[PDB]
Each structure stands twice: as C-alpha cells, then as structure tokens.
Coordinates of C-alpha atoms in Angstrom, one line a residue:
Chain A
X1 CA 22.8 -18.7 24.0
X2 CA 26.0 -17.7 25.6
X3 CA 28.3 -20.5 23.9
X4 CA 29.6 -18.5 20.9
X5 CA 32.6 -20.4 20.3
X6 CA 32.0 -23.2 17.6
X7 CA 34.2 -26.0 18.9
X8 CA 35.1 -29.1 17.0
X9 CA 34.4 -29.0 13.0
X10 CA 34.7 -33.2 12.9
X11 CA 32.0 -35.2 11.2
X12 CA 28.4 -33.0 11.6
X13 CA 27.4 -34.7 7.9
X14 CA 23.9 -35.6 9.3
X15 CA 22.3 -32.2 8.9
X16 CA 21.3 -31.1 5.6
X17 CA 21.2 -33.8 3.2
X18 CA 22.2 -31.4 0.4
X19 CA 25.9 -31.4 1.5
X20 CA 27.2 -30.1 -1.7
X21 CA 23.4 -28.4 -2.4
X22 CA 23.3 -31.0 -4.7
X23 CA 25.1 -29.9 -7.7
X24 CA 24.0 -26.2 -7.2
X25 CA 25.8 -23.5 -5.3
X26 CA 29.2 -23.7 -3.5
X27 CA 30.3 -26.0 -6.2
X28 CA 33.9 -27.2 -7.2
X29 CA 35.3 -22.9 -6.6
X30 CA 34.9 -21.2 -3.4
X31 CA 34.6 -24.6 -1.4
X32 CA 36.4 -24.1 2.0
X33 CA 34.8 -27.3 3.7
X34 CA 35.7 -25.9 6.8
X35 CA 33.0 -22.9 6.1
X36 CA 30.4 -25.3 4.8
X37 CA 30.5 -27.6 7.6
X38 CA 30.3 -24.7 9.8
X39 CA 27.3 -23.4 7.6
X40 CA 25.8 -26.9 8.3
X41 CA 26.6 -26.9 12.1
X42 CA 25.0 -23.5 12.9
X43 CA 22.2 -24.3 11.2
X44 CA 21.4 -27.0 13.1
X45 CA 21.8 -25.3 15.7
X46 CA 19.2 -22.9 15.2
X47 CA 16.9 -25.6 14.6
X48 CA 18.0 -27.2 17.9
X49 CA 16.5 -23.9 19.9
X50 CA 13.7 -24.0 17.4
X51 CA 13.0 -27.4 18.7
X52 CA 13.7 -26.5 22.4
X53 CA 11.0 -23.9 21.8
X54 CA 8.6 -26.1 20.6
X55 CA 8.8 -28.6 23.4
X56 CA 9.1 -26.0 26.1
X57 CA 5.2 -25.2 26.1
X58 CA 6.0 -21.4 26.4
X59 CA 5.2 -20.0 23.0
X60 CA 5.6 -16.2 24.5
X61 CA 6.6 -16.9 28.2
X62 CA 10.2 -17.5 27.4
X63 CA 10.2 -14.9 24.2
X64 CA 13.4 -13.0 26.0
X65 CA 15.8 -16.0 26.0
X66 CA 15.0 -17.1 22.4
X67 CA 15.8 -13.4 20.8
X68 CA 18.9 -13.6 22.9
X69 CA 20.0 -17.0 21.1
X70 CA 18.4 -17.0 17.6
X71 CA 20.0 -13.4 17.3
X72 CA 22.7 -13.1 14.8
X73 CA 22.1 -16.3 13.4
X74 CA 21.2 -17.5 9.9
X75 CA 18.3 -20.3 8.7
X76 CA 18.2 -22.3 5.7
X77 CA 15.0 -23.5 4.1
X78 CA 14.5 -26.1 1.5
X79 CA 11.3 -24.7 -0.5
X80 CA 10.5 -28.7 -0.8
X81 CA 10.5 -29.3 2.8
X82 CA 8.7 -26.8 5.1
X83 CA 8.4 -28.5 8.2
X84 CA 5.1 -27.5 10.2
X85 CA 7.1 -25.9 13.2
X86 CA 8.6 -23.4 10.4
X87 CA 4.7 -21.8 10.5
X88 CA 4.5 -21.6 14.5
X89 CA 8.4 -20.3 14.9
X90 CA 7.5 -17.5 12.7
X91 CA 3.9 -17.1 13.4
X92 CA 4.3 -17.5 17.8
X93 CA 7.8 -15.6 18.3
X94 CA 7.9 -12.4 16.9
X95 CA 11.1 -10.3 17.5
X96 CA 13.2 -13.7 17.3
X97 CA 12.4 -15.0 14.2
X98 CA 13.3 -11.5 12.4
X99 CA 16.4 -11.7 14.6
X100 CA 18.1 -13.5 12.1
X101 CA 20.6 -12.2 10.3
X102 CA 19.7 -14.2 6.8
X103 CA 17.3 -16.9 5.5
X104 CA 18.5 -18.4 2.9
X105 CA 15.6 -20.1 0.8
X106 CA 16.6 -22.9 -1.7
X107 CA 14.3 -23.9 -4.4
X108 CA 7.8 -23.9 -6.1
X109 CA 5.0 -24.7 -3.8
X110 CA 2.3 -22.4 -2.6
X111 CA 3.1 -23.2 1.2
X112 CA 6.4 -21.4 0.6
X113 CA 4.7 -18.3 -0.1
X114 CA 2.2 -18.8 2.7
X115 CA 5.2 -19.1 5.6
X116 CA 6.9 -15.7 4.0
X117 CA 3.9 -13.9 2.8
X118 CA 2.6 -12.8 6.0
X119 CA 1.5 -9.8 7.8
X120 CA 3.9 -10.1 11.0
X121 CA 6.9 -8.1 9.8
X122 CA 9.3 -7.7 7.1
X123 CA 12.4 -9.7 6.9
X124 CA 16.0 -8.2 6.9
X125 CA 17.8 -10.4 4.3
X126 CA 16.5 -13.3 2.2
X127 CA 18.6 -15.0 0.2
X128 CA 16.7 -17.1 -3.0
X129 CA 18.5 -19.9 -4.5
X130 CA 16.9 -21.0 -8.1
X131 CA 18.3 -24.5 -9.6
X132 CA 16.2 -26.9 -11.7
X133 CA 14.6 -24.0 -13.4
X134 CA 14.0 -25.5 -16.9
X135 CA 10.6 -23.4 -17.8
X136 CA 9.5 -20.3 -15.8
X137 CA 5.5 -20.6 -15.5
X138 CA 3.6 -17.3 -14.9
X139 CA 2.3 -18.5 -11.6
X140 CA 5.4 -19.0 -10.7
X141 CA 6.7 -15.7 -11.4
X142 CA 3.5 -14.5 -9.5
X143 CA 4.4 -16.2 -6.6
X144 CA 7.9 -15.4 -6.5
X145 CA 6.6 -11.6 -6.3
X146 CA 4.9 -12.3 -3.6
X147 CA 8.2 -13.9 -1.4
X148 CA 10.8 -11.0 -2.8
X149 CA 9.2 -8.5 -1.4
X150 CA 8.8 -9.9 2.0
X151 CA 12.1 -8.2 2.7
X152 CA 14.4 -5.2 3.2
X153 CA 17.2 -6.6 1.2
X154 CA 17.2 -8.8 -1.7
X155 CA 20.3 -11.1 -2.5
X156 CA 19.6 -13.8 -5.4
X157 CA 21.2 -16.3 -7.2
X158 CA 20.0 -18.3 -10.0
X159 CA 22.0 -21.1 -11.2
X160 CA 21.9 -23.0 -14.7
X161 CA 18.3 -22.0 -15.3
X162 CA 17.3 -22.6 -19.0
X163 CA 13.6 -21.2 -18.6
X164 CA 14.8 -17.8 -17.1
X165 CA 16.0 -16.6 -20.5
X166 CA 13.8 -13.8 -22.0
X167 CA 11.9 -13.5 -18.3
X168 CA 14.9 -12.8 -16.3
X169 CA 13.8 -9.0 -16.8
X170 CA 10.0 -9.8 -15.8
X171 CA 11.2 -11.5 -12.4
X172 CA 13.7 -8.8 -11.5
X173 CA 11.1 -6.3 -12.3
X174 CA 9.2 -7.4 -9.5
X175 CA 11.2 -6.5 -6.6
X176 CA 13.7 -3.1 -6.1
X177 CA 14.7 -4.7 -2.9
X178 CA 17.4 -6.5 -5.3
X179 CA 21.0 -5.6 -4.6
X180 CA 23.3 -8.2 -4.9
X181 CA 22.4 -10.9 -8.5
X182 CA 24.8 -13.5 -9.5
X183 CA 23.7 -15.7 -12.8
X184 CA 25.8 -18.6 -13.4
X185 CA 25.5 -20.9 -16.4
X186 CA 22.6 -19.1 -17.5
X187 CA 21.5 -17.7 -21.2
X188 CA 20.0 -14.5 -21.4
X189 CA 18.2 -11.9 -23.8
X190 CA 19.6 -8.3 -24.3
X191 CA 16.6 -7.2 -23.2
X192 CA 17.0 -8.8 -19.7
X193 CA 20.9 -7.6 -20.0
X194 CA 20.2 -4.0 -20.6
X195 CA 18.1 -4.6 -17.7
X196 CA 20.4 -5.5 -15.6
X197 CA 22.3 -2.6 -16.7
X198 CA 19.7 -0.4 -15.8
X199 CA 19.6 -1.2 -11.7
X200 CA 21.5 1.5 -10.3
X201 CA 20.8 0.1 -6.7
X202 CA 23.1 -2.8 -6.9
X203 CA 26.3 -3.5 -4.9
X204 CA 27.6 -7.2 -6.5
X205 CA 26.9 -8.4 -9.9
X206 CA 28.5 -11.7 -10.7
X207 CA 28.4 -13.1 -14.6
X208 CA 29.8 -16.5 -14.8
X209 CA 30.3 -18.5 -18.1
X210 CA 28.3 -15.9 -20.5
X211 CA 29.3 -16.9 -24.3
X212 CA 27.9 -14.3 -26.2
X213 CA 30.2 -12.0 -26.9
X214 CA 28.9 -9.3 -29.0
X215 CA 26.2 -8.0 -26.1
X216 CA 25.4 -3.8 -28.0
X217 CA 25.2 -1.4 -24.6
X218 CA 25.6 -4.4 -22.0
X219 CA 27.4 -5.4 -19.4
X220 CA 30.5 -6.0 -21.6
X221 CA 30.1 -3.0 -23.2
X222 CA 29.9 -0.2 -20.5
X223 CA 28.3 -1.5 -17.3
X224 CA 29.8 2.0 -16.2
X225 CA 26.0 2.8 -14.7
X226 CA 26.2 0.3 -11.2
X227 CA 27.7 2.8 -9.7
X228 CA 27.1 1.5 -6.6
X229 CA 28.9 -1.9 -7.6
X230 CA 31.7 -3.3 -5.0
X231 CA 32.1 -6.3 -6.2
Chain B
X1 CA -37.4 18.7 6.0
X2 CA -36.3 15.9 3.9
X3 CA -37.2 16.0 0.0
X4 CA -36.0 12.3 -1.3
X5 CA -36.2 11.4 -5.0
X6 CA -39.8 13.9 -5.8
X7 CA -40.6 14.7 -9.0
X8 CA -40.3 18.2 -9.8
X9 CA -42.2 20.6 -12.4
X10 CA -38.9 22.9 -12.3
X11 CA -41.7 25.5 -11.5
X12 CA -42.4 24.0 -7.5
X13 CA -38.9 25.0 -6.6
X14 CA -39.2 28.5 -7.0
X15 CA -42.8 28.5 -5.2
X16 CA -41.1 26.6 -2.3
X17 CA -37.6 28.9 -2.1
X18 CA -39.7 31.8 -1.4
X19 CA -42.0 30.0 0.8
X20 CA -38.7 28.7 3.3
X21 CA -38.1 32.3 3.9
X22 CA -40.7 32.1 6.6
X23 CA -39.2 29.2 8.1
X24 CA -37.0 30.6 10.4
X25 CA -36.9 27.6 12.9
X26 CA -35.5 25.6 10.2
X27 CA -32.3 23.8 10.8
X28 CA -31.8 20.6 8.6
X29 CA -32.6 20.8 4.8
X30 CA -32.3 17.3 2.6
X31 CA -32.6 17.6 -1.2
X32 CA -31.8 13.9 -2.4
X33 CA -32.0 12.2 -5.9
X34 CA -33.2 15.4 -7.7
X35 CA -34.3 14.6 -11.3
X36 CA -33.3 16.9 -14.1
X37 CA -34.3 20.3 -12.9
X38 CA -31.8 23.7 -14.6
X39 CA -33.4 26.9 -13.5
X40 CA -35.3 26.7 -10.1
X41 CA -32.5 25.3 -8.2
X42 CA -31.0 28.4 -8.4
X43 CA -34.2 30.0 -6.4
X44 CA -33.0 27.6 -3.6
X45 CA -29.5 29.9 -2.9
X46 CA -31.4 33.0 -3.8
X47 CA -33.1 32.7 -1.2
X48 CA -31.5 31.0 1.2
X49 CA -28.4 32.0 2.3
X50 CA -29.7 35.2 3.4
X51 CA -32.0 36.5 5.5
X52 CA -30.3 34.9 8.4
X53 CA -31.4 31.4 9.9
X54 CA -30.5 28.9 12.2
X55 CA -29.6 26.5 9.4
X56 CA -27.2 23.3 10.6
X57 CA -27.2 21.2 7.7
X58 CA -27.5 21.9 3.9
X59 CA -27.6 18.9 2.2
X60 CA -27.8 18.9 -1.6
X61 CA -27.0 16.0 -3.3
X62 CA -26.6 15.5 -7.1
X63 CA -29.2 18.8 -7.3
X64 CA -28.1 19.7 -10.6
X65 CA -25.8 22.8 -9.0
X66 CA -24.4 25.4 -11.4
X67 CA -21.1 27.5 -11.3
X68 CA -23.5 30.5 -10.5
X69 CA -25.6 29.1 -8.0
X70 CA -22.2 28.3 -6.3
X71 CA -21.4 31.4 -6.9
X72 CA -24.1 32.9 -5.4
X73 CA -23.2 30.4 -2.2
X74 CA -19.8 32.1 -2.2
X75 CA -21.3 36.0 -2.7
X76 CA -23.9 35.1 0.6
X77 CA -21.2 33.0 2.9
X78 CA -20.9 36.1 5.2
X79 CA -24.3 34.9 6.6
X80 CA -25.4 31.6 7.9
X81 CA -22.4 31.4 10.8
X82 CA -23.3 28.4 12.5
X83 CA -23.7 26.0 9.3
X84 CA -21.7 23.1 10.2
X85 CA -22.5 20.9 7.5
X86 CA -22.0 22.5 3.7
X87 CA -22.4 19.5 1.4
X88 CA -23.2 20.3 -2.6
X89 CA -20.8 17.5 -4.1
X90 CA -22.0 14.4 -6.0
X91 CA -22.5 17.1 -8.5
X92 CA -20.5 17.8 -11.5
X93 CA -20.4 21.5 -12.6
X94 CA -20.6 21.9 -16.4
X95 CA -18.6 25.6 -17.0
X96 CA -17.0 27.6 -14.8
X97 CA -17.4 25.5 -11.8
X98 CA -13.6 25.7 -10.6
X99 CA -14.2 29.4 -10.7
X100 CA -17.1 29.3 -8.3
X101 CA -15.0 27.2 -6.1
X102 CA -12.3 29.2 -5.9
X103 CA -14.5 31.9 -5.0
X104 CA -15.9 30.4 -2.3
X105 CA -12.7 29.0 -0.8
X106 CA -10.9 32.0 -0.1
X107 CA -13.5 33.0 1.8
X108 CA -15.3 31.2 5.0
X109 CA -13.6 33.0 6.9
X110 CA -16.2 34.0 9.2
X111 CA -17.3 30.2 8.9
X112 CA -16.0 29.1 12.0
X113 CA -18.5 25.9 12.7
X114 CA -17.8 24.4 9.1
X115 CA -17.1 19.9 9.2
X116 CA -17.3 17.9 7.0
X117 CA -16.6 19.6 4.0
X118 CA -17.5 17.9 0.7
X119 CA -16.7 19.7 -2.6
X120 CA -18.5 20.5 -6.2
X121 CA -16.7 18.1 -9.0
X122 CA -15.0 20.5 -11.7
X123 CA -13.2 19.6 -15.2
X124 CA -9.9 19.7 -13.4
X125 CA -10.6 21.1 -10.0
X126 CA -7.9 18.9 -9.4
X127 CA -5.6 21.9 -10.3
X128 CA -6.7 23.9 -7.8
X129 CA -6.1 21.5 -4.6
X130 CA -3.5 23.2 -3.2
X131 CA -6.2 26.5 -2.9
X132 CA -8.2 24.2 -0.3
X133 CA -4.9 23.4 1.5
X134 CA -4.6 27.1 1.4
X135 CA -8.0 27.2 4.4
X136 CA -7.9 23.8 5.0
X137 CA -5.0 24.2 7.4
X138 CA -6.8 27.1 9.2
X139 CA -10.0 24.7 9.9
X140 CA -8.8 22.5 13.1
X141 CA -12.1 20.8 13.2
X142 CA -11.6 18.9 9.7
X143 CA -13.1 15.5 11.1
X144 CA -14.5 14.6 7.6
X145 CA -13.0 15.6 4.2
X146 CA -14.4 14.6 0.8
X147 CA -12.8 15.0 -2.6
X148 CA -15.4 12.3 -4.9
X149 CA -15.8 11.7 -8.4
X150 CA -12.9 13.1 -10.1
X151 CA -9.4 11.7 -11.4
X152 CA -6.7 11.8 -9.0
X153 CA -3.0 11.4 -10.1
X154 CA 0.0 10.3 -8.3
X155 CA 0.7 14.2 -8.5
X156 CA -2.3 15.0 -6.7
X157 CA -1.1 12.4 -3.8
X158 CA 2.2 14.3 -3.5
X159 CA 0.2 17.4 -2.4
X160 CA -2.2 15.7 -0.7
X161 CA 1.0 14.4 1.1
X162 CA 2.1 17.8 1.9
X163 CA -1.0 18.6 3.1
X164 CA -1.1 15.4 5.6
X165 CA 2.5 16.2 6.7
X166 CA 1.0 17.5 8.5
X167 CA -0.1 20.4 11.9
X168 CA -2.0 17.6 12.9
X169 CA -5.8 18.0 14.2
X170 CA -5.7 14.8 16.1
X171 CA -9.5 14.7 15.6
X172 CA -9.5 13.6 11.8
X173 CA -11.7 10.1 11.3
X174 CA -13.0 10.2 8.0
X175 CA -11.9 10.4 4.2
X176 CA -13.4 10.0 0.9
X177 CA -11.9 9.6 -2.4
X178 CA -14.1 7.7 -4.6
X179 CA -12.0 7.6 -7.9
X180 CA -8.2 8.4 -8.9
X181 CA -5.4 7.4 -11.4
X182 CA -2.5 6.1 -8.7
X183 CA 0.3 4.2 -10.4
X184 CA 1.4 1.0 -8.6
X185 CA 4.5 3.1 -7.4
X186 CA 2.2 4.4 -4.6
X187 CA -0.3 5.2 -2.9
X188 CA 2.6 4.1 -1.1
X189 CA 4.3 7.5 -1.2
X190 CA 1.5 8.3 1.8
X191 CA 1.7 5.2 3.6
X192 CA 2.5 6.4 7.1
X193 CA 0.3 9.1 7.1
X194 CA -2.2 7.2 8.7
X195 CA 0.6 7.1 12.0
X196 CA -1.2 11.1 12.2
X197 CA -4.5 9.4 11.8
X198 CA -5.3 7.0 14.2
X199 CA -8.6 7.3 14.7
X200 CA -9.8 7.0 11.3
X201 CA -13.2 5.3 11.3
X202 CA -13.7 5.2 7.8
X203 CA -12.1 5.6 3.8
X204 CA -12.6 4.6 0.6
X205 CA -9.4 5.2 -1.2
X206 CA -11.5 3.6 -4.6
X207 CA -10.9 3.3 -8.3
X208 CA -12.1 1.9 -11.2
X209 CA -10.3 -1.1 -11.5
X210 CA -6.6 -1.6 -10.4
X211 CA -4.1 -4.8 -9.5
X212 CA -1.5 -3.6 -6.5
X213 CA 1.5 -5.5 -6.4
X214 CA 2.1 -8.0 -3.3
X215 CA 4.1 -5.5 -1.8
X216 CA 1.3 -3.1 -1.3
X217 CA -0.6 -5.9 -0.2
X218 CA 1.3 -6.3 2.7
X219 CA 1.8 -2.6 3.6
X220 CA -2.1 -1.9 3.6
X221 CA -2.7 -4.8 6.2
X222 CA 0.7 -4.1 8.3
X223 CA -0.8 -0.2 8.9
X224 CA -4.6 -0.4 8.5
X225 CA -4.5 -3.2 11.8
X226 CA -2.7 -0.3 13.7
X227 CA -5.8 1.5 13.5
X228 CA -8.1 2.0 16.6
X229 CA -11.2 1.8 14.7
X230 CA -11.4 1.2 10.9
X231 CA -15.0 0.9 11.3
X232 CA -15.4 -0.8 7.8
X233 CA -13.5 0.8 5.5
X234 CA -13.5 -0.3 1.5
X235 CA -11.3 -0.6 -1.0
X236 CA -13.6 -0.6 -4.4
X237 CA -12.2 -0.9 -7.6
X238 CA -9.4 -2.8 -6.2
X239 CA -8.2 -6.4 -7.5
X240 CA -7.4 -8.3 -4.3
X241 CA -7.5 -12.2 -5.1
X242 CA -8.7 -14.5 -2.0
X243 CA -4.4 -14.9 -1.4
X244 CA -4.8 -10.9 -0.7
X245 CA -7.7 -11.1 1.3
X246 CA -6.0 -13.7 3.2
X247 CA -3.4 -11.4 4.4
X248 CA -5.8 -8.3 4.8
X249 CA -7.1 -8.4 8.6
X250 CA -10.4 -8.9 9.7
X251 CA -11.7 -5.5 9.0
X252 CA -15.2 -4.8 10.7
X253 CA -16.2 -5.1 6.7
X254 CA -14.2 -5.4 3.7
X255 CA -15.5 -5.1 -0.3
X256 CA -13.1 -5.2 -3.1
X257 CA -16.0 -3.8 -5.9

C-alpha cells in the first residue's frame, strides 16, 4: 500500500487480454502506450490485493489495510467475465470497494446487474463502455437502468452502436447522474439530439464522425444550452 | 361497548344515543362496518359530546358521518378533555365536509390528551393540509398520524415535507397514507425524513398501481434497513418485480398489493 511509485513500464501484456479493447476505445487517436500499459499495470494490481484478500481468511479482520491500498485506485470489469471474487470483494469489504476512485464497466448479462445493483452503497464514478451494440432490446435497456443509477456520477461512452439510433434518448432518460457522453461512429435521431441538447447537467460532450449535416435546433445549430460544458 | 357490522333500523340509533347518556362509566365506544344509516348517526354527537364523561376512545368507522355531525364534534370539543383517541375517518363527507374540518381544527385547544389523529375524507381536503400543520406542530405527542383515502400530489409531499422538517417529537412510529398521485420524481423529495423517524413501526405509503424506477428501489431499502423497528410495513399498489424484492431487506412482512 505504501509503494506509490509505478516502476518499470516493460512488457506487463499478460493482464487484460483486450490490449487495444479490441477494436473499441483508445483506438488509433489518443493512444500514449505508455498510459495504457500503465492502465493495465494498475489494474492488476488492484486485482493482486483483491486476491491477497481472498486468501488471507480475514474478510473484515484486516478491513483497515485494504481501504488504505485499494484507495485511489481504479477497476476494470469485462461485463462478459465477472469472476466470483468480484461478488465477495464488494459484498465482504465495505468502505474499500467504494474506495475506488472509478470502475470502468465494458460491455449484457443479468449477473452484471446483480454485482452493481445492490443495497451496500452507492458508487462514486462508473464509467460504461457499449461496443457490439447492433440492436438495443427493451430488457436490455431495463437492465442498464438498473446499473446507471448505482452511482453518483455517470460518465458513458458508446461506440459504433447501430441499434442505439432512435433509443439513445430512452437510455439517457434513465439516469440524471449523466455528465460526461461521448458517441463515436454512431447515427442518431433528432429526437435523441435535441435530447442531448436538452441536459443542462453536462460537463464533456464529444461528437465524433456525425454526417448529417442539416441537424434543425441541434448540437450544430446552437448547443449554446450546456452551459456547464468544459470540454 | 363494541357494535361490529349490526343491522340498523336508522330508528335504534336515536333510542340508544339518549340511552348512553346514563352511562357515565363509559370509556371505549366501537361503531364498525355501519350499513347505510343518514339521520340517526347524528343523535350519536348530539348526545355525546356533552354532558361530560370519561370517554377514551371514540371509534367510528365508515359511520356514514356528515359535515354537520362533524360540525357538531367541533361546536362540543370544549368537553370530553381526556379523549385520547378521536377517529371518524374511513368516511367520505359528501358537502361541506372541509368546512367542518376546518372548524374543528382550529380548535382542540383544550384537547391536550389527543393521539392518533385520523381525519374525515373531503373533495379536496387536500387543500387545507397546511391548516393541520397549523396544530399539528403544537401536539408533541403525534405518535400516530392518518391522512387515508384521498389523492395526494407531489405538491402535497412538499408540504408534508415542510411539515417533517421538522421540531421533531422523537416519539413518532406510525403513518398512514393509503392512496396518492406521486410522480416517479419522488417520493424521493422526502427520503431522509425518516433520519427524524427512527422508530417508525409501521406505514403504508400506498397507491393504486405505480412502477418506481431502480433508483428508488435502492433508496427505499438503503433507509427503511436503518430503521429500529419497521414492524411490517407495506407498500400496496406498488410494482416491485422479484429483482426489487430481491434488493428490499427482509422486512418483518412485506406485500406489494
């Protein structure tokens, strides 16, 4: 917990299959290796502690010295593999688990929404990743709901999704806890763009390759009303 | 004396209001399930309410009140100190009611045993909440408080909200509201307020049918398990599905309709 310092950036490839994310974010702009290897070391370090805590048969006894490491720190979860010690990490160590600084979830399976939609706390920031997103089911949308709110800030990203078109509005109606929405790639209704428009709580708004053009009262039009907008 | 669900002749009634008057030993008074009655209910607080008695308890349930025998109530509330129990709800008053009510709650003031408070149903008493606030504050003994059978909008909450800021009474365990109108943008606007209320026992907080969203969900089981007793508490009317009642703690009892 006191080693801070990251050390030597060699190698460390055998965490996190999804080196590039597999054709999804961090792609050919913004890559920095440097930053994504260092994404990819700290992350396995915070499963390391999560697997010292497992092994060291002290689900509470040793609660003080685990918020002391995991605080500050960031986890990434890969909505297709929730490993069981996920469920007792956040369901055994309270105060350490909402320690973290993110949790970045990557995707939709109904054990997702199990792990976050629980009654132990709320977390700070949740980052959701949506990629192979051809078709947005109902249930889906449902259960989504159920994950966004589970948190005090919302960030989300949705890359080349083809069945988020005409239900990007119903998703980001679900949750006010959205502040910061990129869409990359990613066709879209005026309805869902005067939508966007019309959330005055956001701070970064990111529209990459949008073809359209003529877009009546949107985000190429005024886009004066995000006053909050920084970025 | 307990009079459960007896048929009436609407004649009886006036017969037995002046025969009570010799009863003045008489303490608890039931009058449940009354059938269709009018005039002879009337004879009931004629009589009573005067002529000063030891009565506890007066406990009429859907008894087919009117605005006047209310009235009447209202007019005779400078006797009967001691009454700790004043029921007269599950009743709907056809004209006038909210008149009779209003009557009746600026005064009490020589009520100084009154619990439990339940209230008359009026076409919209509902305007007229902040006039209870107006005594309620002044009661510090409020353990029980029941507003039934009415609409109740998300404006109604807001005062309600005012009125649960609140001088607390630290003695407050149970509350009734068997109907409203609350939007899925809260409710939630009084979450917290149960922080003041920690030894509620009981609520209903009900509708007639309603579908929360998740994050709702989550707020009703993160505060309700702070509770020391939530001795079975419901939540009828409300569209829970077994994901919901998964995350809502194991409550004493729990029904969803």
């Amino acid at each position: 917990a006191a080693v801070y310092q990251h050390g030597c950036l060699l190698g460390l490839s055998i965490a996190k299959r999804p080196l590039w994310r597999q054709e999804s974010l961090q792609s050919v702009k913004n890559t920095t290796e440097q930053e994504i290897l260092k994404a990819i070391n700290i992350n396995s370090f915070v499963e390391c502690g999560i697997h010292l805590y497992q092994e060291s048969t002290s689900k509470s006894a040793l609660s003080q010295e685990f918020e002391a490491f995991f605080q500050g720190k960031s986890l990434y979860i890969n909505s297709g593999n929730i490993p069981d010690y996920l469920f007792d990490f956040f369901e055994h160590l309270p105060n350490c688990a909402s320690a973290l600084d993110f949790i970045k979830l990557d995707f939709i399976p109904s054990r997702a929404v199990s792990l976050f939609f629980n009654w132990k706390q709320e977390f700070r920031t949740l980052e959701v990743t949506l990629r192979d997103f051809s078709k947005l089911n109902k249930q889906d949308i449902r259960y989504l709901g159920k994950i966004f709110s589970s948190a005090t800030s919302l960030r989300l990203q949705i890359k080349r999704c083809a069945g988020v078109a005409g239900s990007l509005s119903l998703v980001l109606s679900t949750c006010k806890n959205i502040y910061s929405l990129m869409v990359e790639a990613s066709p879209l209704t005026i309805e869902d763009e005067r939508h966007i428009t019309s959330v005055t709580n956001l701070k970064t708004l990111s529209i990459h390759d949008l073809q359209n053009q003529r877009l009546p009262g949107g985000l190429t039009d005024s886009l004066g009303n995000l006053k909050n907008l920084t970025k | 004396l307990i009079m459960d669900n007896i048929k009436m002749n609407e004649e009886d009634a006036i017969k037995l209001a002046e025969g009570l008057k010799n009863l003045k030993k008489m303490c608890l008074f039931h009058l449940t399930h009354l059938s269709d009655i009018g005039e002879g209910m009337d004879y009931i607080v004629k009589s009573l309410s005067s002529e000063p008695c030891d009565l506890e308890e007066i406990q009429l349930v859907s008894c087919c009140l009117s605005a006047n025998a209310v009235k009447i109530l209202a007019q005779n509330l400078h006797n009967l100190v001691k009454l700790s129990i004043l029921d007269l709800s599950e009743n709907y008053l056809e004209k006038d009611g909210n008149e009779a009510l209003h009557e009746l709650i600026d005064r009490m003031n020589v009520l100084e045993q009154l619990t439990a408070l339940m209230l008359p149903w009026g076409c919209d008493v509902q305007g007229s909440l902040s006039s209870l606030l107006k005594h309620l504050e002044e009661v510090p003994q409020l353990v029980k408080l029941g507003l039934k059978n009415w609409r109740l909008t998300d404006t109604e909450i807001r005062i309600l909200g005012a009125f649960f800021g609140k001088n607390p009474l630290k003695n407050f365990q149970q509350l009734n509201l068997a109907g409203n109108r609350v939007s899925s943008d809260g409710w939630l606007a009084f979450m917290g307020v149960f922080e003041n209320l920690k030894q509620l026992v009981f609520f209903d907080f009900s509708t007639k049918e309603f579908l929360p969203d998740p994050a709702l969900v989550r707020k009703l089981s993160q505060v309700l398990s702070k509770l020391t007793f939530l001795q079975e508490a419901r939540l009828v009317g409300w569209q829970f599905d077994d994901d919901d009642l998964s995350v809502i703690t194991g409550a004493f009892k729990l029904v969803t309709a």
